[PDB]
């Protein structure tokens with residue numbers, strides 16, 4: 232199982248609810264995190280076990296409350312973060328530059344939902360972060376952006 236460190240999840244982490252869409256927080260929230268476009272962006276999670284595979288899909292819908300909001304115009308998932316296998320438990324953090332994606336809608340002031348997709352042997356698990364993309368974000372704390380190793 233995993234928890235978003237940053238940007239923060241829509242709602243409280245409930246382990247048994249991670250099998251549901253957006254961790255059973257299906258409705259979009261208004262308390263969005265500001266997320267920088269200038270390349271200082273990241274996504275940090277915490278996993279209780281390894282190995283696991285993890286990636287992320289994205290919606291540019293303000294009201295992201297269904298799977299279909301995370302599909303592109305050809306009907307596949309809008310992959311914001313490529314799937315990869317992670318071999319260490321604890322913290323795992325990937326740089327994320329929304330600018331790099333091949334999607335109209337990604338600009339300063341734009342709303343999005345990042346849904347992390349995880350499989351570590353105990354289900355297909357999900358958590359969602361509601362963000363607003365900004366040109367820059369000052370005082371963006373990066374301490375949580377480490378990779379634990381053994």
Ligand SMILES: *[C@@H]1O[C@H](CO)[C@@H](O)[C@H](O)[C@H]1NC(C)=O
Pocket residue numbers: 238239240241242243260262263264
């Ligand atoms: C947004 O507010 C909800 C409801 O109180 C809370 O559960 C969640 O942690 C908040 N999200 C962030 C990113 O602060």
Ligand SMILES: *[C@@H]1O[C@H](CO)[C@@H](O)[C@H](O)[C@H]1NC(C)=O
Pocket residue numbers: 260261262263293342
């Ligand atoms: C972005 O989301 C906020 C809620 O936090 C909302 O007030 C605003 O209208 C949204 N932007 C658009 C263009 O829908």
Ligand SMILES: *[C@@H]1O[C@H](CO)[C@@H](O)[C@H](O)[C@H]1NC(C)=O
Pocket residue numbers: 303304305306307308309310333
């Ligand atoms: C939609 O996303 C899928 C990956 O899930 C990809 O095969 C397809 O090229 C994408 N469509 C685009 C980029 O318009």
Ligand SMILES: *[C@@H]1O[C@H](CO)[C@@H](O)[C@H](O)[C@H]1NC(C)=O
Pocket residue numbers: 315323324325326376377378
């Ligand atoms: C964590 O590992 C991934 C590759 O698995 C890498 O992209 C990322 O930069 C690493 N994070 C840090 C903070 O080193």
Ligand SMILES: [Cu+2]
Pocket residue numbers: 232233279280351353
């Ligand atoms: Cu688990």
